[PDB]
Ligand binder design. Structure first.
Ligand SMILES: N[C@@H](Cc1cc(I)c(Oc2cc(I)c(O)c(I)c2)c(I)c1)C(=O)O
Length: 383
């Protein structure tokens, strides 16, 4: 088995999130097929539910995996994902899609992906973090490359065939799953965690809007767009390097003392989102995309260490579970509201601005977290 555990974990992490991020390239043609009324409002749910259900289901998997074992639940996740992707075929209306794609597919994907971490632990009972960086660099490949394959694949055979063929990834995941073989509400009393856990979800209330609506905002330059997929590929091409660099950066002395760089990340990503609906020359959009992706990777990379910095090591699991439970909502509610925001009398021009407000509030809230304080001074002032 050996290193193949990490090798297959790479494939799993790529397979799930590459699709979840290429969702837009599906959406652009899914809207066209079996098209209308008020379609843009309904369709967004197809990807919104898919992205929300993974986070909603991740915490509960911590009971299933511990109940059945590490080897299981990965086979089951892969099989359920394959069943859902296949069932997405033979659908003559958009209504069943919410159930075939989304609910079923993500309820499979979360089961497939969650146990990967528990077995990356014990990879070699050492050298954690470096393995995670390797896996991130690997999944960067699938995030970068998949949009190119799907874009050319769609025109040859329609959406139905595309989803019926994407089952190859789930099948390979199912086969690789055989490698795995091993060989609570009291948290809120901590004020720092209480503030942070509300700050982050309030910050991400527009994070997933671009990943869904950017490919449809494109075609504003209907003629000059000799190539579209690059504009979405260059988000991941920068996210990979950003995560890789910030993994190294996090622990270095000049900035490891107490990290609040997530405030900077939110500020920059919000500003760049506020920049999209204005730039006209093509290259400016790619520059904005790179600026977005770099900090998008940085913020996600820096998250986990803050978890055990704020709270003891024992409660990190519960902390992450609650955090993902809260995070389930904003990504489900974002894209639909963003689409509808001016689906009457306008375009995304008026919708991308308001997608940029929540990040600033989130950054302020996170910057409003106390520290460097202890109660030994309580004798002096308030008593
Ligand atoms: N849109 C992103 C997808 C993505 C979102 C989040 I939020 C995230 O952060 C975590 C951290 C831990 I730790 C988890 O167990 C989980 I599940 C998600 C990661 I990694 C990836 C992209 O472009 O790839």
């Amino acid at each position: 088995w050996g290193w193949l555990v990490m090798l297959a974990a790479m494939w799993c992490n790529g397979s799930v999130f590459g699709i979840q991020n290429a969702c837009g390239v599906l959406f652009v043609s899914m809207l066209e097929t079996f098209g209308s009324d008020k379609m843009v409002f309904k369709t967004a749910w197809v990807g919104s539910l898919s992205m929300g259900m993974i986070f909603f289901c991740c915490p509960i998997v911590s009971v299933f995996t511990d109940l059945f074992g590490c080897r299981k639940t990965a086979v089951v996740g892969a099989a359920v994902g394959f069943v859902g992707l296949m069932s997405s075929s033979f659908v003559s209306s958009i209504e069943p899609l919410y159930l075939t794609y989304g609910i079923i597919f993500a309820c499979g994907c979360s089961f497939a992906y969650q146990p990967s971490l528990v077995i990356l632990g014990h990879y070699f009972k050492k050298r954690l973090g470096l393995v995670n960086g390797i896996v991130t660099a690997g999944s960067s490949v699938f995030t970068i490359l998949l949009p190119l394959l799907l874009r050319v694949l769609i025109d040859s055979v329609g959406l139905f065939y595309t989803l019926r063929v994407l089952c190859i990834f789930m099948f390979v995941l199912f086969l690789a799953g055989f490698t795995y073989r091993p060989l609570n509400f009291a948290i809120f009393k901590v004020t720092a965690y209480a503030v942070w856990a509300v700050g982050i979800p309030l910050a991400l209330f527009g994070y997933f809007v671009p990943y869904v609506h950017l490919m449809k905002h494109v075609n504003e330059r209907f003629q000059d767009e000799k190539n579209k997929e690059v504009v979405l590929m260059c988000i991941g091409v920068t996210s990979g390097v950003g995560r890789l660099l910030f993994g190294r950066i996090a622990d270095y002395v000049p900035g490891v003392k107490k990290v609040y760089l997530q405030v900077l990340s939110f500020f920059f990503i919000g500003l760049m989102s506020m920049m999209i609906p204005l730039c006209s020359i093509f290259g400016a959009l790619i520059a904005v995309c790179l600026i977005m992706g770099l900090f998008d990777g940085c913020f996600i990379s820096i998250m986990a260490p803050i978890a055990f910095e704020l709270v003891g090591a024992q409660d990190v699991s519960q902390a992450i579970g609650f955090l993902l439970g809260f995070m389930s909502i904003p990504m489900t509610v974002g894209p639909p509201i963003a689409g509808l925001l001016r689906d009457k009398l306008g375009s995304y021009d008026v919708a991308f601005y308001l997608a940029g407000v929540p990040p600033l509030i989130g950054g302020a809230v996170l910057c409003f977290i106390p520290s460097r304080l202890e109660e030994e001074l309580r004798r002096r002032l308030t008593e």
